[PDB]
Every structure is written in C-alpha cells, then in structure tokens.
Coordinates of C-alpha atoms in Angstrom, one line a residue:
Chain B
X1 CA 0.2 -8.3 3.8
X2 CA -2.1 -11.4 3.4
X3 CA 0.4 -13.9 1.9
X4 CA 3.7 -14.0 3.9
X5 CA 7.0 -14.9 2.2
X6 CA 9.8 -16.7 4.0
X7 CA 13.1 -16.1 2.2
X8 CA 16.1 -18.4 2.3
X9 CA 19.3 -19.0 0.4
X10 CA 22.3 -16.7 -0.5
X11 CA 25.8 -16.7 0.9
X12 CA 29.2 -16.2 -0.5
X13 CA 30.4 -17.5 -3.9
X14 CA 33.3 -16.9 -6.3
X15 CA 32.7 -15.1 -9.6
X16 CA 31.4 -17.5 -12.1
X17 CA 29.6 -19.5 -9.5
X18 CA 25.9 -20.2 -8.7
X19 CA 23.5 -19.7 -5.8
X20 CA 19.7 -20.2 -5.5
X21 CA 17.3 -18.1 -3.5
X22 CA 14.0 -19.5 -2.3
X23 CA 10.8 -17.8 -1.1
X24 CA 8.2 -20.0 0.6
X25 CA 4.8 -18.5 0.7
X26 CA 2.2 -19.0 3.5
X27 CA -0.5 -19.8 0.7
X28 CA -1.1 -19.8 -3.0
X29 CA 0.1 -16.8 -4.9
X30 CA 0.0 -17.8 -8.6
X31 CA -3.0 -15.4 -8.9
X32 CA -0.6 -12.4 -8.3
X33 CA -0.1 -10.3 -11.4
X34 CA 3.6 -9.9 -10.4
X35 CA 5.8 -12.4 -8.7
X36 CA 9.3 -11.0 -8.5
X37 CA 12.8 -10.7 -7.2
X38 CA 14.4 -7.3 -6.4
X39 CA 18.1 -6.3 -5.8
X40 CA 19.4 -3.6 -3.5
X41 CA 23.1 -2.8 -3.6
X42 CA 24.6 -0.8 -0.5
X43 CA 24.1 2.8 -1.6
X44 CA 21.5 2.2 -4.3
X45 CA 17.7 2.1 -4.7
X46 CA 15.9 -1.3 -4.7
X47 CA 15.2 -2.4 -8.2
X48 CA 13.1 -5.3 -9.8
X49 CA 15.5 -7.8 -11.6
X50 CA 13.2 -10.8 -12.5
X51 CA 9.4 -11.4 -12.5
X52 CA 6.8 -13.9 -13.6
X53 CA 3.7 -12.2 -14.9
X54 CA 0.7 -13.5 -13.0
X55 CA -1.5 -15.1 -15.7
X56 CA 0.3 -16.2 -18.9
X57 CA 3.3 -17.1 -16.9
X58 CA 5.7 -15.2 -19.0
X59 CA 8.9 -13.9 -17.6
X60 CA 10.8 -10.6 -17.7
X61 CA 14.4 -10.0 -16.7
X62 CA 16.3 -6.8 -16.3
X63 CA 19.2 -6.5 -18.9
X64 CA 21.7 -6.7 -16.0
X65 CA 20.7 -10.3 -15.2
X66 CA 19.1 -11.7 -18.4
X67 CA 20.6 -15.0 -19.6
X68 CA 22.3 -15.6 -16.2
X69 CA 19.4 -15.6 -13.7
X70 CA 16.2 -17.7 -13.9
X71 CA 12.9 -17.2 -12.0
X72 CA 10.7 -20.3 -11.4
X73 CA 7.7 -21.2 -9.2
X74 CA 6.4 -24.4 -7.7
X75 CA 2.6 -24.2 -6.9
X76 CA 2.7 -27.6 -5.0
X77 CA 5.2 -26.2 -2.5
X78 CA 4.2 -22.5 -3.0
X79 CA 7.8 -21.6 -3.5
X80 CA 9.3 -18.9 -5.8
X81 CA 12.9 -19.4 -6.8
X82 CA 15.8 -17.3 -8.2
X83 CA 18.6 -19.5 -9.7
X84 CA 21.6 -17.3 -10.1
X85 CA 24.3 -18.5 -12.5
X86 CA 27.5 -16.9 -13.6
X87 CA 27.7 -14.6 -10.8
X88 CA 29.7 -11.4 -10.8
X89 CA 31.0 -9.1 -8.1
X90 CA 28.5 -6.5 -9.3
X91 CA 25.7 -8.9 -8.3
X92 CA 26.7 -8.4 -4.6
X93 CA 23.5 -7.1 -2.9
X94 CA 20.6 -7.8 -0.7
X95 CA 17.8 -9.7 -2.6
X96 CA 14.1 -9.6 -1.8
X97 CA 11.1 -11.5 -3.1
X98 CA 7.7 -9.9 -3.5
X99 CA 4.4 -10.8 -5.1
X100 CA 1.3 -8.6 -5.7
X101 CA -0.7 -8.5 -2.4
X102 CA 2.0 -10.5 -0.5
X103 CA 4.4 -9.1 2.2
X104 CA 8.1 -8.7 1.3
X105 CA 10.6 -11.5 1.9
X106 CA 13.2 -10.7 4.4
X107 CA 16.3 -9.5 2.6
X108 CA 19.2 -12.0 1.9
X109 CA 22.8 -11.2 1.2
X110 CA 24.6 -12.5 -1.8
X111 CA 28.3 -11.7 -1.9
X112 CA 30.4 -12.5 -5.0
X113 CA 34.2 -12.6 -4.4
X114 CA 36.9 -11.7 -7.1
Chain P
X1 CA 23.7 5.3 -16.1
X2 CA 24.0 5.8 -19.9
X3 CA 20.4 6.9 -20.7
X4 CA 19.2 9.7 -18.3
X5 CA 15.5 10.1 -17.4
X6 CA 13.9 13.5 -16.7
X7 CA 10.7 13.0 -14.7
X8 CA 7.8 15.5 -14.6
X9 CA 4.1 15.5 -13.5
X10 CA 2.4 14.6 -10.3
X11 CA 0.7 17.0 -7.8
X12 CA -2.4 17.0 -5.7
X13 CA -5.7 15.5 -6.7
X14 CA -9.0 14.4 -5.2
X15 CA -9.8 10.8 -4.9
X16 CA -11.3 9.6 -8.1
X17 CA -9.2 12.0 -10.1
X18 CA -6.4 11.5 -12.6
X19 CA -2.8 12.6 -13.1
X20 CA -0.2 11.8 -15.6
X21 CA 3.5 11.3 -15.0
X22 CA 6.1 11.7 -17.8
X23 CA 9.7 10.5 -18.1
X24 CA 11.7 12.1 -21.0
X25 CA 14.8 10.1 -21.9
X26 CA 18.1 11.5 -23.2
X27 CA 18.1 8.8 -25.9
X28 CA 16.2 5.7 -27.2
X29 CA 15.4 3.1 -24.6
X30 CA 12.8 0.8 -26.4
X31 CA 15.6 -1.8 -26.4
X32 CA 15.5 -2.1 -22.5
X33 CA 14.0 -5.3 -21.3
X34 CA 12.2 -3.5 -18.6
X35 CA 10.7 0.1 -18.8
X36 CA 8.9 0.7 -15.6
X37 CA 7.2 2.9 -12.9
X38 CA 7.9 2.3 -9.2
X39 CA 6.0 3.6 -6.1
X40 CA 7.5 4.4 -2.6
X41 CA 5.1 5.3 0.2
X42 CA 6.6 7.1 3.3
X43 CA 7.7 4.2 5.6
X44 CA 7.7 1.5 2.9
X45 CA 10.1 -0.2 0.4
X46 CA 10.0 1.0 -3.3
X47 CA 8.1 -1.4 -5.4
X48 CA 7.5 -1.8 -9.2
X49 CA 3.8 -1.0 -10.2
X50 CA 3.8 -1.0 -14.0
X51 CA 6.2 -2.1 -16.7
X52 CA 6.5 -2.6 -20.4
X53 CA 8.6 -5.6 -21.3
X54 CA 11.3 -4.6 -23.7
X55 CA 10.7 -6.6 -26.9
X56 CA 7.1 -7.8 -27.4
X57 CA 5.8 -4.7 -25.8
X58 CA 3.5 -6.5 -23.4
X59 CA 2.6 -4.8 -20.1
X60 CA 2.4 -5.9 -16.5
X61 CA 0.7 -4.2 -13.6
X62 CA 0.8 -4.8 -9.9
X63 CA -2.7 -5.9 -8.6
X64 CA -2.9 -2.7 -6.6
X65 CA -3.0 -0.5 -9.8
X66 CA -4.3 -2.8 -12.5
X67 CA -7.3 -1.4 -14.4
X68 CA -6.7 2.1 -13.0
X69 CA -3.1 2.9 -14.3
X70 CA -1.7 2.6 -17.8
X71 CA 1.9 2.7 -18.9
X72 CA 2.7 3.9 -22.5
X73 CA 5.8 5.0 -24.4
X74 CA 6.4 7.3 -27.4
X75 CA 9.7 6.5 -29.3
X76 CA 9.4 9.7 -31.4
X77 CA 9.7 11.8 -28.2
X78 CA 11.5 9.1 -26.1
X79 CA 9.0 9.6 -23.3
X80 CA 7.6 6.9 -20.9
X81 CA 4.2 7.8 -19.4
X82 CA 2.1 6.7 -16.5
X83 CA -1.6 7.7 -16.7
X84 CA -3.2 7.4 -13.3
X85 CA -6.9 7.2 -13.2
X86 CA -9.3 6.7 -10.3
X87 CA -6.9 7.7 -7.8
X88 CA -7.2 6.7 -4.1
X89 CA -5.6 8.1 -0.9
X90 CA -3.5 4.9 -0.8
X91 CA -1.8 5.9 -4.1
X92 CA -0.1 8.8 -2.2
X93 CA 3.6 8.2 -2.7
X94 CA 6.8 9.2 -4.5
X95 CA 6.9 7.8 -8.1
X96 CA 10.0 6.9 -10.0
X97 CA 10.6 5.8 -13.6
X98 CA 13.4 3.4 -14.5
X99 CA 14.5 1.4 -17.6
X100 CA 17.1 -1.3 -17.9
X101 CA 20.5 0.4 -18.2
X102 CA 19.0 3.9 -17.6
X103 CA 19.5 6.1 -14.5
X104 CA 16.5 6.6 -12.2
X105 CA 14.0 9.4 -12.7
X106 CA 14.0 11.9 -9.9
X107 CA 11.1 11.1 -7.6
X108 CA 7.7 12.9 -8.0
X109 CA 5.1 13.3 -5.3
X110 CA 1.5 12.3 -6.0
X111 CA -0.9 13.2 -3.2
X112 CA -4.5 12.1 -3.2
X113 CA -6.9 13.9 -0.8
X114 CA -10.1 12.4 0.8

C-alpha cells in the first residue's frame, strides 16, 4: 500500500534482556497519523502496543509494555524503531510495524527465554 | 482479561450513512493507556483505527477514517463508542473494541452497500 515497510531485528534473548526492531520505509511516512508496532502471540489476536501520533509526535504505549519499550523514528533514514528493554517470556510473539497508508512490515519473531 | 467488553451495534447501511458501535465494560477502564477500535476486513490483518490515549484523553485516528469516525467514552456508563459517519463500501469489516488490560469485544459486522 503506497509506502512499503521492510522489517528487521528480533531473535532470542534472555528475560531481562533487550532487542531492537527496525522498519525501513520506501519513502517518507512522518505524515501518517499513526506509525505503530503491533504484537501477535500464537493463539491471540494482533494488537497495537506502541505508536507515534502523526503530527504532534506524541507517543502511546499499551499498559503491557509502557516503561519497557520505546518507539522512535528517523526521517533522514525513514526508519521506525522499537527498542525493547526488560524483556519477559510473555513478550514472546511476532511483531509487525504499520503506518497509516503504508503496507504491513513482514512479521518478526521475538522469543524470550526463562 | 480483568475488564470484560460487551460489544453491540453495526448492521447494514448505504454509502454515506452512519452507524454507531458501543462497547460496555464490566468496570472502569479510563485508567487504560489505550482505549481503541480495531478493523478487520475479510482477507486482511486487524488494524487499529481509532483510540483514546489513557491519561490526557487525546485521540488518534488512522488516515483511512479521520474526519469521518469519532471515538468517545462515558465513564458513568463505562461505555466506549465509535460513531461512524460517511460510510464507504471500503469500511465493510468486522470491528472490535479493546482497552489496555481488558478482554477483546466480540467482533461486529458493518456492511456498507453501494
């Protein structure tokens, strides 16, 4: 859908650890009302966990990740980031990026061991 | 998940028309960082379209619905609403409500005819 998102990052980390996800866009997307990261656990619905609101640049985080995850965006490189800190086994899921009008990032796996 | 959401509303409407969706919670949820409505078209991923950010009460809308849809919340009744105006065939989808820490609303169908 117009702007394409190439997702990278993820892997396997111990609880308490950190991982960063990246989402490189094919063009500018700072004009999107919503620039977000979504989480989908195995038998669960996909759900938004972090977003930048296109315009005032304010952020929103779901209670489950607030204070541990941080969403940022670099308009020089046209990259949206998700810095995950203090990871927990419950954060194990496929992660997707999406912006208003853009296509979805391909899902990445994040696995958090005991 | 702690607070339960009972979804109601939807139906069939002509393009240009209006419908309201409601989501009655089992308890207070104004403390949720995210109070939102999500859209899932038949062969597509679920996606957030409108949210109230728990705290400052500011809103965010995906570009696809901004200026046509409005999200509101009544803390006396503990109901989250989505007022949909100027409906288009492309808005045809299953709609779900969700708040941080709450369970998902059961999906409702909204069908917009020619």
